[PDB]
Design a protein around this motif. Sequence first.
Motif, PDB file in Angstrom:
ATOM      1  N   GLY B 100      -0.057  -1.422  -2.476  1.00 25.29           N
ATOM      2  CA  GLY B 100       0.496  -0.642  -1.395  1.00 25.29           C
ATOM      3  C   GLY B 100       1.913  -0.180  -1.639  1.00 25.29           C
ATOM      4  N   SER B 101       2.799  -0.524  -0.723  1.00 26.61           N
ATOM      5  CA  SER B 101       4.104   0.061  -0.642  1.00 26.61           C
ATOM      6  C   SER B 101       4.788  -0.743   0.429  1.00 26.61           C
ATOM      7  CB  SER B 101       3.979   1.497  -0.182  1.00 26.61           C
ATOM      8  OG  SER B 101       5.257   2.025   0.030  1.00 26.61           O
ATOM      9  N   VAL B 102       5.925  -1.350   0.127  1.00 29.28           N
ATOM     10  CA  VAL B 102       6.588  -2.179   1.100  1.00 29.28           C
ATOM     11  C   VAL B 102       7.722  -1.447   1.819  1.00 29.28           C
ATOM     12  CG1 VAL B 102       8.340  -3.996   1.379  1.00 29.28           C
ATOM     13  CG2 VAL B 102       6.011  -4.355   0.101  1.00 29.28           C
ATOM     14  N   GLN B 103       8.097  -1.851   3.018  1.00 28.76           N
ATOM     15  CA  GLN B 103       9.157  -1.149   3.700  1.00 28.76           C
ATOM     16  C   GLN B 103      10.077  -2.181   4.314  1.00 28.76           C
ATOM     17  OE1 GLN B 103       5.843   0.869   3.305  1.00 28.76           O
ATOM     18  NE2 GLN B 103       5.961   1.391   5.513  1.00 28.76           N
ATOM     19  N   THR B 119       2.344  -0.641   3.682  1.00 29.58           N
ATOM     20  CA  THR B 119       1.393   0.434   3.861  1.00 29.58           C
ATOM     21  C   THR B 119       0.348   0.142   2.850  1.00 29.58           C
ATOM     22  OG1 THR B 119       3.019   2.012   4.441  1.00 29.58           O
ATOM     23  CG2 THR B 119       1.013   2.883   3.560  1.00 29.58           C
ATOM     24  N   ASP B 120      -0.890  -0.062   3.240  1.00 27.54           N
ATOM     25  CA  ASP B 120      -1.851  -0.421   2.239  1.00 27.54           C
ATOM     26  C   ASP B 120      -2.209   0.771   1.279  1.00 27.54           C
ATOM     27  OD1 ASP B 120      -3.763   1.082   3.621  1.00 27.54           O
ATOM     28  OD2 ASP B 120      -4.106  -0.603   5.044  1.00 27.54           O
ATOM     29  N   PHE B 122      -4.579   2.203   1.183  1.00 26.45           N
ATOM     30  CA  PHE B 122      -5.411   3.221   1.799  1.00 26.45           C
ATOM     31  C   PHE B 122      -4.601   4.079   2.778  1.00 26.45           C
ATOM     32  CE2 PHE B 122      -8.887   0.678   0.050  1.00 26.45           C
ATOM     33  CZ  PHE B 122      -8.586  -0.651   0.391  1.00 26.45           C
ATOM     34  N   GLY B 123      -3.315   3.841   2.882  1.00 23.16           N
ATOM     35  CA  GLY B 123      -2.568   4.731   3.732  1.00 23.16           C
ATOM     36  C   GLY B 123      -2.274   4.234   5.139  1.00 23.16           C
ATOM     37  N   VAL B 124      -2.617   2.987   5.448  1.00 25.00           N
ATOM     38  CA  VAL B 124      -2.411   2.433   6.758  1.00 25.00           C
ATOM     39  C   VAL B 124      -1.141   1.595   6.803  1.00 25.00           C
ATOM     40  CG1 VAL B 124      -3.491   0.548   8.270  1.00 25.00           C
ATOM     41  CG2 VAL B 124      -4.681   2.550   7.679  1.00 25.00           C
ATOM     42  N   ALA B 125      -0.268   1.907   7.745  1.00 24.05           N
ATOM     43  CA  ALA B 125       0.982   1.049   7.892  1.00 24.05           C
ATOM     44  C   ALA B 125       0.702  -0.243   8.655  1.00 24.05           C
ATOM     45  CB  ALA B 125       2.031   1.836   8.618  1.00 24.05           C
TER      46      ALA B 125
END
Lengths: 133, 133
Positions: B100-103, B119-120, B122-125
């Motif tokens: 994913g992507s961390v924030q 945000t996985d 798959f695009g879900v936060a």
Amino acid sequence: SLQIVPYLIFNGNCREAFSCYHQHLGGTLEAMLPFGDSPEPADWKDKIMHARLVVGSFALMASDNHPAYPYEGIKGCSISLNVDSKAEAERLFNALAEGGSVQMPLGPTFWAASFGMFTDRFGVAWMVNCEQD
Amino acid sequence: SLQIVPYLIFNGNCREAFSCYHQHLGGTLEAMLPFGDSPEPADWKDKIMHARLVVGSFALMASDNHPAYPYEGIKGCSISLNVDSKAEAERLFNALAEGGSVQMPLGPTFWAASFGMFTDRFGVAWMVNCEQD
């Protein structure tokens, strides 16, 4: 245990939006906390750090965007409302839709007795859905 | 009654996600109806007309988007997970973030023992939230 709740982001009108969710959805507004009355920066900006609307055993949470992050409205998803009666589906559809716009007019479909899609005037896509009667 | 339920729209990868979701979060996947077996255009796409994941008294819903309609991703919005353990947070933060992507990395804050935004694949936060052990 394990509670899944949607968290939404408004660009400044969270307080107005939740007050109306409250009025129409019922429940208890457990939190309406401004950045001002918190550990926050920005100046003259007491928009809403965090807000929590609890309804029975579900919850909406929200926040007014931090002005350090660009704002896009709400997009990938919608807040679906499964209600027990046509009267209620109509009443909610009517309430939140006012001022906004309708993607799919309230009425029956092959899977529900009354269903609709709309965005409210604070930018939030809803579904209202009543399977039963 | 009144059920609030977030409806996610995916761009072709609803199966793979709800699968993954099903796995990590556990619970029951009722519904994984593809268009092909639907009671209803656009062949060459037998993707997810409707999917529903139920964990305890909560749920998640989704489908892949109709191809006519343009897809702007999932934006103004995040599914908040609240659970009991700082482990359970770590577990969920770690699986669902892989690829994913961390924030906000996982750690304490003034309102939570453990907490993290990401945000996985798959695009879900998602938010993960814990407040005890």
